[PDB]
Amino acid sequence: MRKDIHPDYHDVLFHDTNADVFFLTRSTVKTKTTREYEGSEYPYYPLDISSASHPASFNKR
Amino acid sequence: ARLKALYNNELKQKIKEELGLDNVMQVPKITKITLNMGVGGASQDKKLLEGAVADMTAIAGQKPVVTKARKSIAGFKIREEWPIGCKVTLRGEQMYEFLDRLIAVAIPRVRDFRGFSPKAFDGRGNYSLGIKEQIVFPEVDFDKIDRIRGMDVTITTSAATDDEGRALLKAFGFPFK
Amino acid sequence: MLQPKRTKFRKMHKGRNTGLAHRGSTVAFGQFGLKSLTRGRMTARQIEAARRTITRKIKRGGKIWIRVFPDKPISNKPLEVRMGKGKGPVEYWVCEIKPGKMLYELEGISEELAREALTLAAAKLPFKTTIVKRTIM
Amino acid sequence: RDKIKLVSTAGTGYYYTTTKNKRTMPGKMEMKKFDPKIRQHVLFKEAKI
Amino acid sequence: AHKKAAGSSRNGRDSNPKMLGVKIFGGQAIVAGNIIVRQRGTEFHAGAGVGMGRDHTLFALNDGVVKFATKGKFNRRYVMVEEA
Amino acid sequence: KKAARLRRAKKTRAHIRFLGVYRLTVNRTPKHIYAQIISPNGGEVIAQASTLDGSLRSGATGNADAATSVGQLIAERAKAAGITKVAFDRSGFKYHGRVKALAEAARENGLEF
RNA sequence: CGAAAGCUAUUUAGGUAGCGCCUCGGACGAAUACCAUUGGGGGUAGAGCACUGUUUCGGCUAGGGGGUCAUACCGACU
RNA sequence: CCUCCUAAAGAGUAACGGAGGAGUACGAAGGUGCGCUCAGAACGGUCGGAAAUCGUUCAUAGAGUAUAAAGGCAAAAGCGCGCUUAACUGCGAGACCCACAAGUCGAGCAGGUACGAAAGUAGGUCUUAGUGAUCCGGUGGUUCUGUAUGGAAGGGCCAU
RNA sequence: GCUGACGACCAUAGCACGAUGGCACCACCUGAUCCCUUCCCGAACUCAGAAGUGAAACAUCGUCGCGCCAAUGGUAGUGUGGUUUCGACCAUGUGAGAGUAGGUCAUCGUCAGCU
């Protein structure tokens, strides 16, 4: 891993609002706001859908 | 890299018994993850490719490498060593953060998603998928975007058979079927 | 009129047909062959004259093998042309024949009609031929 | 390729002579060649031949 | 010139001889500098005591007796000058 | 891979024997580092120094400090062998770290190359 | 005593020049030749398809040669 | 002028014999140190296919080598990167080839370097084509000469 | 007895398939602060190390399935002398290639380490 050739790679808190499940993972996205997690305040990136929220007729005459 | 810690904690163990391996060192693991974004329209506009390099930097988190044509093809208007694609190889903790992001944040954001066919294995336990719209990743933003683009995601595992490869990927919760 | 579809080189050195046919001297495909007792050049017009004659005798009841292919171009100088000024153009294709080589084989046909057809083929050939039965060794 | 004269900068008048493409190398070429008059490597500057 | 099929085929040129080949054969006394093989490429390779020129020429680095052997994992033809 | 490591060692190995000089061949592993001196013929070992010696077997081998001791140790053994002028063979390994540390100790403690 | 009608070059090709071949003298003396044993490298004769081609027969098939409704996804079968 | 065959297993060997190339290129496409391995086939994968890019498995060269062909090429002579100018100067034991005039290879020595940690390697390029004598005239240098003497002109020598 | 280094030799040594090995040694292996790495990547290189494992690799052993090697005999060619119908033949001296019987899972040297 060289230096000063790679983009900024900081922690971001992904939060699926549907199921209210968080996802702590480092990434590059610059979040607008930053909420407080169990450890400290991480850049908050709201998320809409995640892995925890993503998935004859003639007889009526 | 929660998956790095979580793989060595229980995924490595549970795969061994589920596949009936006799040696802990014989369990499959993911070795490298390569992201290919081969842009054939380059060398004729010289604007598409830098936008691809800008896209991969945000997505993978590493400076990508610009792959040059290995052979001259007159049909595709391609000469020796022209830049017709970028690629990035992810290993160690860098792959496991990307895989977590791809499994939980990126794949659900695929429009009209039904699952990935398990018959897309090359036969040596190596998986390769394809993302049509690069906007699925939250790292890239919709507002100041150049244009919609796709990208290859190739997962290289230490497995020797297709059955071991899919069992390994199922452990992480990969969206099969 | 047999001839190679394409060759590496247009023209060839005369060469020297000598020796015995130690290869291609046994009946290998048919059950009944016609081999040569003398050497020489077997042009591609003699191939098709002996081959047309055997076909008319077997009358879609047998199988003919041609163990001789002409792949050697023979140049010829036209009339009223001095010596030199190059090498003449190619006019025909011979196959080099040595004593022992079969030229044709038959199979699937009465031994009387096969002898009667190979006899008629030798008449169009420049060789003293003979009639040979396929053996074990 | 035209012929050029590589002339030492030591003012001894010693020179080499070589060819160059004046479309891929339009400027003057300079190199450190050995000068037998002073038995020393010095810069040689391209001159018209 | 009836049948008119002849005509010029201009290929009447060739190059001069190069006088290649083995100059000193095995078991012969040799002195340093003597050319052993003139060749194109390394048909023979330089063994101990034999040098190789820019022309691929093999020459004796030191006096002795020239020796030929096929050695190595590539089954190459080597020429050596044994101190004898 | 050892096959690739020996593929990039062959250029020096073959040039050493053309020079007709004694060579200092080194071999390191993730546990040990070896150093032996081969004859110009190439089939005789005349001096060796490894981390299997009792002086520094029961110690922290596989280390840059252990490589220095081996280089210091072979220089003494080479000195009491008649050998003073060798040609270093890095045996495909990069001339760095453990291999380098061994070379400086050998080069400073009597062997000159 | 005893050739040459060769090589190279040539406004050369039936001329000429160097070398090769002859003679005379001098120097040198086995360093030369033949034969036996022995150390070498070769790619010819022959041979053979392992390469480059070419060639015949059979087996075997993605591509091709044909026949209802059938842009019905170009389908059953030769 | 170069390559193959003719050419008869050393060299050489002719024809208005059979086939092809040359009259260049490159300050890196040279030197060195370090590193690397190709062509294809199949499988998987967005556009994307027969073939662009990616990943996997076989794969002594079925590739490449600036330029024809032959012979070579894994220590690669093939492919990249860093630093460089040995594409030096004076030479050269010894050979090949050779009518001559020419041509070819060359260890080693001295000086000055370039790369390497060093042993070392480097006097252009994988080699074999890319060429033209003398005369004459020009140019850069030189104490050699300098028609009474000092110069100078002219000439000589070295380089072009 | 086995392991490693460097050599001889360059398939009778290779390929393939199976089995054995972890006390040393070797290999995977952990980690990436450090030296040093990547036209991106601790993959390779490099370092610091010892939780795991002989799974891969490697080494060793076994076999004839492939590959490789390979007679005897005969044939082809051929130097010399002779003859010939020009194909060849005789005397003498040589003598293949292909193919067959068969052989083959190498063989040694120096040094170090565990036993």
Side-chain angles (χ1 to χ4, degrees), chain A residues 1-29 33 35-40 42-61, chain B residues 1-35 37-42 46-76 78 80-177, chain C, chain D residues 1-21 24-49, chain E residues 1-3 5-84, chain F residues 2-113:
Chain A
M1 207 80 182
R2 284 180 171 178
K3 57 212 163 302
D4 70 30
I5 82 169
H6 296 306
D8 191 359
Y9 207 58
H10 51 57
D11 267 339
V12 66
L13 176 48
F14 289 132
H15 163 79
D16 178 297
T17 61
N18 266 332
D20 274 339
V21 58
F22 292 72
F23 279 117
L24 189 152
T25 301
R26 198 162 63 239
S27 190
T28 57
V29 61
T33 177
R35 74 195 305 107
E36 201 269 336
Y37 191 67
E38 77 192 301
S40 88
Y42 309 145
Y44 172 37
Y45 188 102
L47 187 64
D48 58 354
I49 184 168
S50 67
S51 65
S53 75
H54 190 284
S57 185
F58 187 37
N59 291 129
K60 60 95 181 176
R61 76 273 190 191
Chain B
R2 57 161 290 249
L3 268 66
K4 173 77 166 272
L6 170 130
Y7 177 89
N8 302 355
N9 275 25
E10 70 269 14
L11 293 182
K12 194 154 53 152
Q13 297 293 321
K14 72 178 49 165
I15 286 202
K16 183 176 73 175
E17 291 101 13
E18 182 263 349
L19 290 173
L21 272 306
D22 51 49
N23 203 350
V24 58
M25 183 84 228
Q26 201 177 333
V27 74
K29 66 179 178 291
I30 303 161
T31 52
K32 85 174 77 143
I33 287 170
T34 325
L35 280 71
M37 195 138 90
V39 282
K46 196 75 90 168
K47 298 273 217 66
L48 314 187
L49 183 139
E50 307 89 32
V53 173
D55 285 7
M56 206 105 84
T57 38
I59 294 161
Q62 280 187 3
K63 174 168 191 311
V65 75
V66 169
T67 67
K68 303 190 269 303
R70 101 177 210 298
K71 204 73 61 163
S72 272
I73 310 284
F76 302 144
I78 290 307
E80 282 312 88
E81 286 89 15
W82 285 345
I84 60 170
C86 57
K87 99 186 184 69
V88 57
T89 323
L90 281 76
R91 296 179 214 249
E93 273 100 340
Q94 194 87 349
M95 77 153 42
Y96 278 134
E97 296 155 57
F98 170 89
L99 199 147
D100 183 14
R101 283 190 281 112
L102 185 138
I103 285 284
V105 189
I107 286 308
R109 284 169 63 99
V110 172
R111 165 227 317 270
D112 192 350
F113 185 53
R114 284 257 92 211
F116 284 110
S117 66
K119 75 159 285 203
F121 274 83
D122 52 14
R124 268 81 184 208
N126 294 299
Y127 200 52
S128 299
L129 62 96
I131 275 177
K132 297 178 176 67
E133 293 179 353
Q134 58 87 28
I135 61 169
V136 297
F137 294 91
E139 289 93 21
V140 67
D141 52 60
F142 195 79
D143 185 13
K144 54 286 199 203
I145 189 173
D146 181 279
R147 100 200 210 168
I148 304 301
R149 188 162 25 236
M151 158 201 39
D152 288 359
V153 174
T154 300
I155 288 161
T156 315
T157 88
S158 145
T161 325
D162 192 357
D163 292 330
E164 319 207 340
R166 71 179 40 114
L168 175 67
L169 277 182
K170 177 180 305 318
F172 295 108
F174 196 85
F176 281 147
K177 61 71 199 173
Chain C
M1 272 279 252
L2 303 184
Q3 174 201 330
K5 275 316 165 286
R6 50 169 200 111
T7 76
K8 190 174 328 182
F9 294 108
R10 270 192 334 151
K11 300 179 168 70
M12 247 182 203
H13 280 176
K14 196 198 304 305
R16 289 292 184 302
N17 171 36
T18 88
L20 283 165
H22 299 276
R23 301 283 300 292
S25 72
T26 177
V27 184
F29 298 119
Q31 258 278 330
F32 202 172
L34 170 136
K35 76 159 55 167
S36 208
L37 312 173
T38 55
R39 74 179 66 259
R41 282 182 182 159
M42 174 141 183
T43 199
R45 292 182 177 267
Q46 299 151 3
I47 304 294
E48 195 188 10
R51 175 215 76 72
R52 283 194 267 203
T53 282
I54 308 165
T55 49
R56 223 175 277 126
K57 287 321 285 196
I58 58 129
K59 189 75 62 69
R60 53 175 290 168
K63 218 190 145 303
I64 301 154
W65 286 266
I66 306 164
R67 296 198 59 92
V68 159
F69 188 87
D71 47 359
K72 184 189 154 55
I74 298 307
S75 66
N76 254 220
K77 273 200 159 302
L79 295 177
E80 302 162 349
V81 179
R82 306 284 176 79
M83 296 279 122
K85 311 168 68 144
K87 184 171 186 290
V90 287
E91 322 281 2
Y92 55 107
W93 301 78
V94 302
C95 180
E96 223 68 50
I97 305 312
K98 296 185 180 185
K101 189 84 173 77
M102 289 62 37
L103 316 177
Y104 304 93
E105 285 149 311
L106 273 40
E107 182 262 6
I109 204 60
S110 181
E111 199 205 42
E112 271 85 328
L113 193 75
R115 271 170 192 280
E116 218 179 6
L118 267 48
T119 293
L120 290 183
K124 330 277 166 174
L125 297 184
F127 301 115
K128 288 183 150 318
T129 74
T130 191
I131 282 269
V132 278
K133 300 306 314 281
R134 180 193 210 294
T135 59
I136 287 126
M137 269 174 6
Chain D
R1 306 170 56 98
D2 297 36
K3 291 184 188 81
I4 62 171
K5 196 149 75 178
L6 279 180
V7 180
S8 76
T9 53
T12 66
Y14 189 73
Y15 65 88
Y16 296 84
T17 279
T18 183
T19 66
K20 82 182 221 156
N21 201 342
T24 74
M25 173 174 348
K28 281 88 183 187
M29 68 177 285
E30 67 272 18
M31 263 186 327
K32 274 207 241 176
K33 295 292 216 118
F34 168 75
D35 195 314
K37 299 331 180 76
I38 61 186
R39 277 145 65 201
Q40 276 320 332
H41 271 63
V42 314
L43 205 81
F44 279 60
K45 274 219 286 227
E46 145 164 345
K48 224 81 172 182
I49 194 167
Chain E
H2 277 116
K3 197 119 163 63
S8 212
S9 297
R10 186 273 218 251
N11 51 30
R13 86 232 127 247
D14 195 3
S15 67
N16 300 337
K18 286 317 174 292
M19 289 66 89
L20 302 183
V22 182
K23 264 41 174 161
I24 302 166
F25 299 80
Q28 294 194 25
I30 200 175
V31 302
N34 275 19
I35 289 167
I36 311 178
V37 191
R38 305 216 88 150
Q39 59 187 3
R40 297 286 168 265
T42 50
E43 290 155 17
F44 292 92
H45 289 85
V50 161
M52 182 204 171
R54 65 170 303 277
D55 213 343
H56 304 307
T57 315
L58 306 177
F59 57 99
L61 295 170
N62 36 27
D63 308 337
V65 158
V66 56
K67 185 212 195 189
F68 289 80
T70 288
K71 273 194 339 203
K73 83 213 162 93
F74 283 111
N75 287 40
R76 299 289 168 78
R77 299 181 289 178
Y78 275 90
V79 65
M80 296 81 54
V81 168
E82 296 190 307
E83 315 320 314
Chain F
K2 183 206 271 163
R5 201 252 299 164
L6 301 158
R7 199 268 306 152
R8 82 178 79 95
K10 221 158 262 304
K11 174 69 181 294
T12 290
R13 291 266 182 69
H15 180 71
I16 293 302
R17 64 173 310 199
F18 156 75
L19 298 178
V21 294
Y22 286 89
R23 95 170 173 257
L24 169 62
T25 282
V26 308
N27 176 43
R28 72 162 176 73
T29 77
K31 316 198 64 63
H32 298 268
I33 180 162
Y34 314 95
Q36 62 184 178
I37 291 170
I38 317 299
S39 59
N41 154 37
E44 301 119 284
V45 182
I46 62 171
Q48 54 87 24
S50 34
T51 62
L52 308 153
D53 191 68
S55 69
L56 60 84
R57 182 47 161 291
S58 295
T61 178
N63 193 358
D65 295 8
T68 307
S69 288
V70 163
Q72 189 268 332
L73 164 72
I74 188 163
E76 311 303 302
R77 281 180 219 203
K79 264 294 177 272
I83 306 301
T84 61
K85 218 190 244 163
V86 298
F88 190 72
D89 182 22
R90 60 185 174 84
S91 296
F93 302 109
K94 184 192 174 77
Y95 180 76
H96 176 72
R98 272 139 60 62
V99 170
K100 176 143 136 213
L102 181 151
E104 283 138 18
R107 170 152 43 205
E108 186 206 0
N109 289 136
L111 288 174
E112 52 93 7
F113 59 83

